[PDB]
Design a protein around this ligand. Structure first.
Ligand SMILES: O=P(O)(O)Oc1c2c(c(OP(=O)(O)O)c3c1[C@H]1C[C@@H]3c3cc4c(cc31)[C@H]1C[C@@H]4c3ccccc31)[C@H]1C[C@@H]2c2cc3c(cc21)[C@H]1C[C@@H]3c2ccccc21
Ligand SMILES: O=P(O)(O)Oc1c2c(c(OP(=O)(O)O)c3c1[C@H]1C[C@@H]3c3cc4c(cc31)[C@H]1C[C@@H]4c3ccccc31)[C@H]1C[C@@H]2c2cc3c(cc21)[C@H]1C[C@@H]3c2ccccc21
Ligand SMILES: [Cl-]
Ligand SMILES: [Cl-]
Lengths: 230, 230
């Protein structure tokens, strides 16, 4: 790789500087380099990886939506289709890269439950992004790959984590978005979101000092989605 | 070039779609392709060229400032200097490209006064951006190149345009920023900004329907700078 000659510690240091400069493509490329050294990621390093790639595909998804909607209003030439296809191909490339890193280096049968749930949630998120732009018989394959990763993550977090854990809360929030937008199961989405909120409020005594901010933010987002789906 | 096989009309169409999707790198590359066909740009096309490249270098300048300030707080390793140099080199590449297009294709002895002033202002803006990151004896050469382009633009706009013309107003606004930030002449900056505002207000009867929005915006920015420099 292009980062093969740089020290692991230097790549992590530069990913942080790229975050502060809002240079998210650079950030993602530095973290890919770090992962390719073959060592495990710390809790802090996992978050750098996630923030980098989330910001890159987020910008691609927003552009793809603007162009896809303009394309449909034509019903002008081949130009809109051509440019929409170009952004699509680039988005698919980024998703394939992240999923490649998850299968090659990061997902393991061992490690703590925080680690395994984090990478399986990530695996679900990026199959979900591929599902938003797919159409064929492969779309059905992609949706079942997303559901499967999300469901194994849910099973582990119910056994191993308290209901106020922010990784458990975020997982359930995104899996409920999967139900509503991709699976067309709005009842199953509403249900999952309400019980996630309710079960956290019933066992507030488990709330940790170090994740008061993160957990609270995700509770508000769960409620905002329920307001919208009523 | 990479856009050599595409029709002129298709490149202009795709630059507009890229604007709507906030894909400013694509936008700039499509407009470079359009310029390289060798025909003049319309008023609307000139604005597409300007908006594309302004947005690209704007993001680079903001990152360069965040990293340059972090670097100075070290007084930790070579990592901050190395990454700051990388963003700098990339910023200089974009400025050289724009200045190359201006000298090769766009700046002419003929054409209307709106055209000539527009490209000379652009020439000043991008030498100004190179001056922000330069240090040596070449910095002095770069500042004099910026002043010279800006001054020839001012001379033409005073003879050929009314004092409420938004291209004339924008030119003077940016030339006053050049005085304050790059030339360290805060008196000369304050003076130019006040007389630009005052002379527009004295001759309000020249204000055009098609530029009421643009001219008004730039008047407010001239006043906001004066509030700051008092
Ligand atoms: O240092 P931490 O334990 O990791 O948590 C704090 C943070 C921060 C803190 O200070 P700051 O937000 O003024 O910049 C704090 C904390 C701890 C110490 C201080 C703070 C303040 C507060 C809480 C925890 C913390 C509880 C009570 C108060 C608060 C407001 C909103 C939600 C949760 C809380 C920064 C840095 C970090 C943080 C996180 C966020 C945000 C900002 C921060 C933004 C985006 C996200 C967030 C969630 C909810 C509301 C607003 C935000
Ligand atoms: O169609 P145009 O003649 O080119 O001008 C109008 C515009 C627009 C118009 O509608 P909009 O701003 O509600 O979206 C208008 C015009 C003409 C017709 C309507 C409008 C409204 C107004 C004016 C001119 C126009 C004068 C009086 C009122 C106004 C408010 C602020 C500054 C100047 C004006 C859009 C599109 C365009 C425009 C430009 C701007 C903006 C928005 C627009 C933003 C960013 C910049 C701006 C400058 C000052 C304040 C706010 C803005
Ligand atoms: Cl294209
Ligand atoms: Cl670097």
């Amino acid at each position: 790789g292009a980062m093969g000659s740089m020290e692991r510690a230097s790549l992590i240091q530069k990913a942080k500087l790229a975050e502060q400069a809002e240079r998210y493509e650079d950030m993602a490329a530095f973290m890919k380099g770090a992962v390719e050294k073959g060592e495990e990621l710390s809790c802090e390093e996992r978050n750098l990886l996630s923030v980098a790639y989330k910001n890159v595909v987020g910008g691609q998804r927003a552009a793809w939506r603007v162009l896809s909607s303009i394309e449909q209003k034509s019903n002008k030439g081949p130009e809109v289709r051509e440019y929409r296809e170009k952004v699509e191909t680039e988005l698919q490339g980024v998703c394939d890269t992240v999923l490649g890193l998850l299968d090659s280096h990061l997902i393991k049968e061992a490690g703590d439950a925080e680690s395994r749930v984090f990478y399986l949630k990530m695996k679900g998120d990026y199959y979900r992004y591929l599902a938003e732009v797919a159409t064929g018989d492969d779309k059905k394959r992609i949706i079942d790959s997303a559901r499967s990763a999300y469901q194994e993550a849910m099973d582990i977090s119910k056994k191993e984590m308290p209901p106020t854990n922010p990784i458990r809360l975020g997982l359930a929030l995104n899996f409920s978005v999967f139900h509503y937008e991709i699976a067309n199961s709005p009842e199953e989405a509403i249900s999952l979101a309400k019980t996630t909120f309710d079960e956290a409020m019933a066992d507030l005594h488990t709330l940790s000092e170090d994740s008061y901010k993160d957990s609270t933010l995700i509770m508000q987002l769960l409620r905002d989605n329920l307001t919208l789906w009523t």
